[PDB]
Structure 1
């Protein structure tokens, strides 16, 4: 079949460009570029809540990463500033985020930069974890390696990453998911960084929930946030127990609208 390998670059997405197949019209995302690790980790991934990797090509000095096109864009653009989004939408997005993080941790991979800018949505609004540029293997041959590298985005990083030389990988991703949940329900970030010098972080540890952003969040999802945003990473809730939380299993959202007629 001629010209089936030809792709037209039509527009910029983030450099990330939208590529359309000349024959089939299939839309994919092409990342034009550390890189050796990013490609190797992407080759390991296959999950409905993780951005698909189709392959790569090296044209001299420029690397082309052929990745899944998510038409719904970033989760970031679904959060209304100072408001957030309806609680049933946030719960569905957090469910899908947990599925992706369970998968990644299961094959021994930590994302290390979970934030709404890296959580993409497909045509049916399904969440997909993207950007494995900061990702690393924390478990090899069923042996866990403790991390020591400073990775992430300060409002989403766990406090152990700033206070300890070494730390476990999994509680760091759990913490960033908790800040993502906060952003979805309150439309604002609680602190600039989780340090004692940050007044907003100090007030949370002092349980001053009468202040923003916590005053906008209902008691049921707030009780879960009280279990995730725990300073001690050893005392912090694990994903198996997040799945047992009362709000996590609270019926709130209906299914996708489905065409129906009467009489």
Structure 2
């Protein structure tokens, strides 16, 4: 089945994404369009074929079509999580907890099959029709485990506000703690409506304030003791002392009843 390109959802750097609706079955699917150094897109396709989870953007197929590559993907009519975050306020705590539960479920899945996303942020977290979170954009993703053997990462990538301090300070570093750190920055953004720092370096005043436990300053003063205590465990400088995902599922705020059922 071939598809018709109706509208443009959003032009994201490398090219554009379009709402491709078939005119027979009316099945809606997003379509990333990248103009082909084609090791970035060919790696993205292989990793996408491995994926199969409720909190990850599904990959249906692809088409070389001469020079223009067409990644067919799951359509998410809700848009980005970025746009559900009101500046300076964040969102209701119950909403933030549900999105965090779904984010952890998706990140647990990826880490279980040996994949790290490497650029988790509200802009890459899409929402479907019933507001379920789905991790998207695996163009920076890579294998950190193969045949039950971990491999350290050496490539610096991602986004500076969301990036863990060890990838700026160390030549090599574990992949999983980096993903956990960025999930913690996403949580901060959901509960405060702002990012805590430009980068986690010692040459950044805001980061140094956080290490000195000065939680009377923004954004920490907007949060609340329960989720803040979880943030104290995630945003630990040393990745070996940093909390893991199994232990995040045992956290008090993570298991606090807050939100009601379906409407």
Q: TM-score, normalising length from structure 1?
A: 0.95
Answer whether contact 1:49 1:96 (CA < 8 A) is retained. yes
**1:143, CA displacement in angstroms?**
0.5
Per the alignment, in what secondary structure is the counterpart of residue 28 of structure 1? strand
Say if 1:72 and 1:125, in contact at 8 Å, map to a contact too. yes
Say which SS state the counterpart of residue 48 (structure 2) adopts. Answer: helix
CA deviation string 1:1-50 (max 9, x = no partner) = xxxx1311111128111100110111100011111110000000000000
CA contact (8 A) 1:38 1:135 kept: yes
Question: 2:29 maps to what in 1?
Answer: 28
SS at match of 1:59: coil
Alignment partner, residue 151 of structure 1: 157
CA contact (8 A) 1:83 1:185 kept: yes
Deviation at 1:112, TM superposition (A): 0.1
Does the residue aligned with 2:6 lie in a helix, a strand or coil?
strand
Alignment of 1:49-64 (within 5 A): 49-64=55-70
1:10 aligns with 2:11: no
DSSP-derived class of the 1:56 partner: strand
Q: Which residue of 2 aligns with 1:118?
A: 124
Q: Deviations over 1:97-118 (max 9, x none)?
A: 0000000000000000000000
Question: Residue 183 of structure 2 corresponds to which residue in structure 1?
Answer: 177
Alignment of 1:1-263 (within 5 A): 5-13=1-9, 15-33=16-34, 34-257=40-263
Which consecutive unaligned segments of at least 5 residues does structure 2 have?
10-14, 35-39
Are the counterparts in 2 of residues 174 and 238 from structure 1 also a CA contact under 8 Å?
yes
Q: Which moved more, 1:166-175 or 1:27-36?
A: 27-36
**Native 8 Å contact 1:6 1:22 kept in 2:** no
Unaligned runs of 5+ in 1: 258-263
Cα deviation, residue 221, structure 1: 0.2
Tell me whether 10-19 or 140-149 shows the greater mean CA deviation: 10-19
Superposed CA RMSD in Å reads 0.7
CA distance in 2 between counterparts of 1:164 and 1:7 reads 46
CA distance in 1, matches of 2:8, 2:212: 45
Q: Note the alpha carbon deviations across 1:93-148, whole angstroms, 9 max, x for none.
A: 00000000000000000000000000000000000000000000000010100001
Q: TM-score with structure 2 length normalisation?
A: 0.95
Once the two structures are superposed, residues 46-72 of structure 1 have per-residue CA deviations (whole angstroms, 9 ceiling, x without a partner) of: 000000000001011110000000000
Larger Rg: 1
CA distance in 1, matches of 2:72, 2:154: 31
1:74–1:119 CA contact under 8 A, matched in 2:
yes
Q: How many residues align?
A: 253
Alignment deviations for residues 155-183 of structure 1 (CA, whole Å, 9 cap, x no partner): 00000000000000000000000000000
